[PDB]
Amino acid sequence: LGTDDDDKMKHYSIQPANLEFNTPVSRDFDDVYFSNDNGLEETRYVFLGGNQLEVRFPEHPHPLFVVAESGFGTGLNFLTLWQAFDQFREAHPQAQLQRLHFISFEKFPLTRADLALAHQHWPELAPWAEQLQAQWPMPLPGCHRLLLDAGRVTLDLWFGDINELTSQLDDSLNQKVDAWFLDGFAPAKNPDMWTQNLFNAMARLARPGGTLATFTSAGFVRRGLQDAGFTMQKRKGFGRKREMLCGVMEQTLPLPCSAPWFNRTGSSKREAAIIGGGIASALLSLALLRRGWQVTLYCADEAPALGASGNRQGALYPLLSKHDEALNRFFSNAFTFARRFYDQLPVKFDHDWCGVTQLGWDEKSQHKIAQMLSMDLPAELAVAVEANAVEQITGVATNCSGITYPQGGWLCPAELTRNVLELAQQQGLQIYYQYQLQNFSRKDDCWLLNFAGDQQATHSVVVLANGHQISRFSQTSTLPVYSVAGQVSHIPTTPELAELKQVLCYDGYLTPQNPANQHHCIGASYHRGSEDTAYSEDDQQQNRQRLIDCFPQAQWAKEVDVSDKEARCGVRCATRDHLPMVGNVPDYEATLVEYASLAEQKDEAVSAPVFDDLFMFAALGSRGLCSAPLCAEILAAQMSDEPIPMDASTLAALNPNRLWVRKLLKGK
Ligand SMILES: Cc1cc2nc3c(=O)[nH]c(=O)nc-3n(C[C@H](O)[C@H](O)[C@H](O)COP(=O)(O)OP(=O)(O)OC[C@H]3O[C@@H](n4cnc5c(N)ncnc54)[C@H](O)[C@@H]3O)c2cc1C
Ligand SMILES: C[S@@+](CC[C@H](N)C(=O)[O-])C[C@H]1O[C@@H](n2cnc3c(N)ncnc32)[C@H](O)[C@@H]1O
Ligand SMILES: [Cl-]
């Protein structure tokens, strides 16, 4: 034992569908995706009509409707639903139902090319089809979220085998699905996907009273779903087909609580105070406002992005890893989500998706790159680059190989934070600057916040998104986060340095010029356990010098000029395991008492001891531009008892009580 023999069976890319036309036909399955002339009206009859969506929409007593689907395929069901939802909202703008959520699972996703071709056969759907195509995700495993129409429609595509994926979903998703679209290839010649495990999962995820519909009337499917707990009914088939099936969950099933120590719970309340001013608090605000939360932001400073989020140019690429499975999945999916989110964001901020190139300057660095190169990632995520091609790619001669992230680049985090915050204010965010939270206590049924002035406010929900100062409250004092101060030097461009087309990562990082500035940013110093933001001359020199040590023959590297003493200093908040800390704020003392002997009383274990209606968005390290968007989704979903776009184990890797609970589990 102890060998890497497993690695040859692991895959970090999902493979696309083998498509042909005549209508899209699957080569692998020898079936059509849908029927030829009548595909659109059949879709409306089977999936919309069989779940009685038109009747239910105007009386639906929740602001969200959640449809879940087996087998996304062409997207026809999704597009047809969206169209119907849009028509519903126009006819009944006063209805409580304001937002659509669609969760689909897909083993063989279409390429962007095939998807665009499939959609050509339905010019009626083109306004919706085009928006889908604009965000169609890179085929990586697991959950991919697309905010469509500014969050009015949300699409979670889970890439992989549906029968592997269903047991990977978080508990939060149970009893949340209003309607099932049980699609797939005709049972009698894809029996493989129509399993009991599938039907049971559908039953688990179904809201009590929730529906399902399907095209087939195969006996074994009817009985399988009855055994899962749905009340099933035969209804007339569209066209030639004599019969289809629909069902209702007419009972309340026992709610699952495996791993209660990782329970992500939400809140019933809809007004929140956020303690922040940085990227995290900014993106969170958007995510909460689009759901009709009342949001108040408090910031200690005179203006926002004076914390760690205040640089002029930060790099955006994912931290990949061969050994940390959860770190790799998080950053890969956060990264591509971050790119879609930033593309869609109606806010001006200086950026350029010019690519990021990491360089093998060292034996130690070549080896970390080689580790990453030995995973089969899609080229669109990360791809090797020879030494000869590096100069063509980056613009500069580095004299060594590397790996490039072609969808990566730089953005201006200070401006992004300010302009997002300014958008949130137009959407209703109340900001109070020069409000430094000292304290908060539970009074009656509110959180009482005490600011440094004898100022007080009361709020229903409090979210701590205050960077390195996260652990300065008694209810947070024992979080395993630590401060890392650092300095990024601002440098003028030269003729040699104006040739840089990309962000270079080495023992440090160098951005290309911001053409509006004629300046690059180059960093960064790393001071573990320091909260000191004073300008350091040694750090400044060292930001130049590290670059020169990595590429000793590079005449462009010597043209870096730090003599202006221009720099920016901030304090990162990090964890040993490099993942964020996002979720309920855990009660340390109550965790330790309640899970004292957890190593042998797992079965009787209570829900994770947390503070009520108190959340945190924290520890973004030096990769917050990459991680904040998806973390904003996760937290705001969790807070709202809405579908979280991540698998259970990656969520557990992001839970704030994780260190304590890991030790307590193993008895230590
Ligand atoms: C040197 C350096 C280089 C970096 N390089 C990169 C990079 O290349 N790529 C990248 O993606 N990221 C980079 N980062 C940033 C990293 O992503 C940070 O972790 C990120 O900016 C964290 O943002 P935040 O919103 O969590 O916290 P912050 O930006 O630190 O914001 C904290 C906010 O909380 C407020 N606050 C604190 N205490 C209180 C209080 N008690 N009451 C009210 N308000 C309070 C502060 O006013 C502040 O506005 C870098 C950061 C540094 C310092
Ligand atoms: C009939 S198509 C789906 C319908 C789609 N909305 C359309 O109109 O084109 C069937 C889909 O099921 C998918 N599928 C088959 N087995 C699967 C599995 N085990 N997990 C996830 N998807 C699967 C296929 O990839 C295919 O995309
Ligand atoms: Cl930055």
Residue numbers in the entry: -7 to 14, 18 to 663
Relevant lines from the article:
Methylaminomethyl modification of uridine or 2-thiouridine (mnm5U34 or mnm5s2U34) at the wobble position of tRNAs specific for glutamate, lysine and arginine are observed in Escherichia coli and allow for specific recognition of codons ending in A or G. In the biosynthetic pathway responsible for this post-transcriptional modification, the bifunctional enzyme MnmC catalyzes the conversion of its hypermodified substrate carboxymethylaminomethyl uridine (cmnm5U34) to mnm5U34. MnmC (formally known as YfcK or TrmC) is a bifunctional enzyme responsible for the final two steps of biosynthetic pathway of mnm5s2U in tRNAGlu and tRNALys, and mnm5U in tRNAArg. The C-terminal domain (MnmC1) catalyzes the flavin adenine dinucleotide (FAD)-dependent oxidation of the Cα-N bond in cmnm5U34. The resulting imine intermediate is (presumably) non-enzymatically hydrolyzed to 5-aminomethyl uridine (nm5U34), followed by S-adenosyl L-methionine (SAM)-dependent methylation to yield mnm5U in the N-terminal domain active site (MnmC2).
Here we present the FAD/SAM-bound crystal structures of full-length MnmC from E. coli (ecMnmC) and Y. pestis (ypMnmC), and an FAD-bound crystal structure of ypMnmC. In the ecMnmC structure, out of 668 residues, only residues 15–17 and 664–668 could not be modeled. Our structures show that ecMnmC and ypMnmC bind SAM in an almost identical manner. Most interactions between SAM and the protein occur through van der Waals contacts and hydrogen bonds with backbone carbonyl groups, including Phe-67, Thr-69, and Ile-157 in the ecMnmC structure. In addition, the side chains of Phe-24 and Phe-180 contact the nucleoside segment of SAM, shielding it from bulk solvent in the ecMnmC structure, although Phe-24 is not visible due to disorder in ypMnmC structure. The distance between Cϵ of SAM and Oδ of the Asp-178 side chain is 4.1 Å in ecMnmC and 3.6 Å in ypMnmC. The next closest polar side chain belongs to Asp-26 in ecMnmC, which is 6.6 Å away. FAD interacts extensively with the C-terminal ecMnmC1 domain through 16 hydrogen bonds with side chain and backbone atoms of 10 residues within 3.2 Å. Each domain contributes about 40 residues to the interdomain interface, which buries 1578 Å2 of accessible surface area in ecMnmC. In addition, there are three pairs of ionic interactions in ecMnmC; e.g., Arg-94/Glu-637, Arg-107/Glu-375, and Arg-140/Glu-628; only the Arg-140/Glu-640 interaction is present in ypMnmC.
